[PDB]
Amino acid sequence: MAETLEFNDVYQEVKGSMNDGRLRLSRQGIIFKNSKTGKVDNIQAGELTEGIWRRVALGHGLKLLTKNGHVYKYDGFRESEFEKLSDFFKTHYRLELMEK
Three-class SS string for the chain?
CCCEEEEEEEEEEECCEEEEEEEEEECCEEEEEECCCCCEEEEEHHHEEEEEEEECCCCEEEEEEECCCCEEEEEEECHHHHHHHHHHHHHHHCCCCEEC
Buried (b) or exposed (e) across 71-93, using 16+ Cβ within 10 A?
A: ebbbbbbeeebeeebbebbeebb
Q: In what order do the strands lie in the sheet with 40-44?
A: 40-44, 29-34, 17-26, 4-14, 71-77, 60-66, 48-55, 98-99
Of 27, 31, 28, 29, the residue nearest 7 (C-alpha):
31
The amino acid present at 41, given as its one-letter code, is D
Sign (positive or negative) of CA dihedral 15, 16, 21, 26 = positive
The per-type count for the chain, helices as H runs and strands as E runs, is 1, 8
What is the rounded distance in angstroms from the CA atom of residue 8 to the CA atom of residue 17?
18
CA 20, CA 3: separation in Å to the nearest integer? Answer: 23
Instruction: State the method.
Output: X-ray
Give the resolution in Å.
Answer: 1.5
Going from N- to C-terminal start, the domains of the chain cover 2-100
